[PDB]
Amino acid sequence: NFMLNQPHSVSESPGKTVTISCTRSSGNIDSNYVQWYQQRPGSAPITVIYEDNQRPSGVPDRFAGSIDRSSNSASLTISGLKTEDEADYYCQSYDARNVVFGGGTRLTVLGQPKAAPSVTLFPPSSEELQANKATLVCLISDFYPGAVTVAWKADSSPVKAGVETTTPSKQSNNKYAASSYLSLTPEQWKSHKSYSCQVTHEGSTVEKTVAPTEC
Amino acid sequence: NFMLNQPHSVSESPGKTVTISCTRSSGNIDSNYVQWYQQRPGSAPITVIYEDNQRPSGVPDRFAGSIDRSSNSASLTISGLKTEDEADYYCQSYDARNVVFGGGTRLTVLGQPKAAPSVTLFPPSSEELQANKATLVCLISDFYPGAVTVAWKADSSPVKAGVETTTPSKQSNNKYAASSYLSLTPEQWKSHKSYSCQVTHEGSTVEKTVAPTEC
Numbered sequence: 302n303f304m305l306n307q308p309h310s311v312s313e314s315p316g317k318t319v320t321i322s323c324t325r326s327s328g329n330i331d332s333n334y335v336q337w338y339q340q341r342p343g344s345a346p347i348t349v350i351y352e353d354n355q356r357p358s359g360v361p362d363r364f365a366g367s368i369d370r371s372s373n374s375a376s377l378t379i380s381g382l383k384t385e386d387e388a389d390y391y392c393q394s395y396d397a398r399n400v401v402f403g404g405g406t407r408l409t410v411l412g413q414p415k416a417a418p419s420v421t422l423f424p425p426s427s428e429e430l431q432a433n434k435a436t437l438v439c440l441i442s443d444f445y446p447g448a449v450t451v452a453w454k455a456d457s458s459p460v461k462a463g464v465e466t467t468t469p470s471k472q473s474n475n476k477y478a479a480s481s482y483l484s485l486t487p488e489q490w491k492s493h494k495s496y497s498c499q500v501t502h503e504g505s506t507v508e509k510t511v512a513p514t515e516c
Numbered sequence: 517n518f519m520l521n522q523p524h525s526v527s528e529s530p531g532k533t534v535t536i537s538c539t540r541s542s543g544n545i546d547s548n549y550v551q552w553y554q555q556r557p558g559s560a561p562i563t564v565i566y567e568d569n570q571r572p573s574g575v576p577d578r579f580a581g582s583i584d585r586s587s588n589s590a591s592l593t594i595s596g597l598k599t600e601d602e603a604d605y606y607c608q609s610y611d612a613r614n615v616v617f618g619g620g621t622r623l624t625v626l627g628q629p630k631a632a633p634s635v636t637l638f639p640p641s642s643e644e645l646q647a648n649k650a651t652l653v654c655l656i657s658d659f660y661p662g663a664v665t666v667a668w669k670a671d672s673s674p675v676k677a678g679v680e681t682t683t684p685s686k687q688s689n690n691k692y693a694a695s696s697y698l699s700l701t702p703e704q705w706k707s708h709k710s711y712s713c714q715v716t717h718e719g720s721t722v723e724k725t726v727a728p729t730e731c
């Protein structure tokens with residue numbers, strides 16, 4: 302029985318090299334294979350190293366596994382650091398009576414560039430209106446950092462009720478996405494000339510407007 | 517190689533028994549050992565079962581591994597459910613050097629009543645069409661537990677490319693919301709008769725369809 306000790310957290314800027322150590326508490330690091338897993342928030346882990354230093358297909362060659370018997374440790378070295386590398390990393394080995402994991406290392410990539418959101422506003426569908434409901438959705442994607450504020454307008458007037466905005470989550474392009482949705486009656490929707498969603502990100506506001514459409 | 521297919525989510529109340537299955541797509545489940553890993557949100561993985569049914573020391577006998585050759589499946593059974601059992605559970609096996617992980621099952625220990633999601637599917641906005649974009653958005657609101665899986669269809673064909681789903685977040689009504697969006701070209705969107713959003717939650721799959729037109 303042994304533990305694998307990892308740093309709690311490491312931070313580095315893009316294009317730099319970072320090293321994550323994994324020290325075996327008891328027994329020799331080289332008595333069993335060390336694996337490394339990467340996990341992005343809200344995703345399942347992916348293997349980036351097995352058998353100490355082997356990369357599965359799809360893993361970039363920027364990921365290098367090594368063993369240092371003299372410090373009884375394994376290391377994951379990431380060269381040419383990219384923002385997609387921001388994640389939790391877990392080392393793992395074998396006891397014969399167990400698969401044991403490190404406590405994990407949070408890798409922060411500093412100085413990721415600002416990215417203004419794409420904002421798309423969807424009016425209620427004919428189908429939804431037929432079911433006596435009216436929802437607007439303001440889709441907000443491709444933004445960094447992951448903080449927006451949203452204000453809604455009925456004509457020019459502030460909407461103060463029926464608004465929800467999801468907590469931004471990092472998507473596969475490593476920029477944030479969220480939706481703000483406004484629940485209306487069909488009568489409220491048809492009573493105004495338009496509704497607007499105003500998304501503020503890092504001091505800049507993007508406004509979209511939709512209106513009831515005749516045929 | 518093969519896949520290990522787990523249900524996306526399971527739930528129960530404290531003190532109850534829940535089973536998580538793991539079906540091997542090809543080859544015999546008993547040809548190779550099955551392991552089970554627990555990952556509590558914001559924690560490192562831990563092994564709860566190795567070699568089909570062995571418990572590492574420290575793992576309570578509330579956790580039980582089994583093999584069903586009949587269904588070519590493994591199962592984890594957790595009895596006496598406690599709130600600390602809320603976690604993602606992964607099964608894992610191999611054929612020679614190919615290591616295969618299951619997709620993971622979210623186990624929720626119910627803190628509040630179950631709630632089926634409202635699903636609203638939006639066709640592309642006129643404005644975005646004139647920016648050469650045809651994003652579809654599937655809003656998913658008012659659900660508990662906070663675990664959903666979304667699958668998209670172009671006519672009758674599963675879509676893979678261009679799907680993004682946000683991590684479910686708890687809104688002001690203490691229920692979860694998320695959005696799945698499919699980033700289409702206007703030509704992709706018009707080249708099909710319909711697209712469909714399939715949302716799976718707590719033993720049910722709801723479906724919504726949208727189609728092109730002018731109005």
Ligand SMILES: CCN(CC)c1ccc2c(C)c(CCN3C(=O)N[C@@]4(CCN(C(=O)c5c[nH]cn5)C4)C3=O)c(=O)oc2c1
Binds near residue numbers: 338347351391553618
């Ligand atoms: C919490 C438990 N846990 C331990 C960290 C997980 C959980 C799920 C996963 C999942 C889902 C994947 C992704 C899918 N996938 C596999 O099922 N197998 C590989 C392909 C081959 N591989 C190997 O490790 C491998 C192949 N020859 C030797 N080793 C990982 C893979 O990418 C993965 O790679 O690693 C996982 C690890």
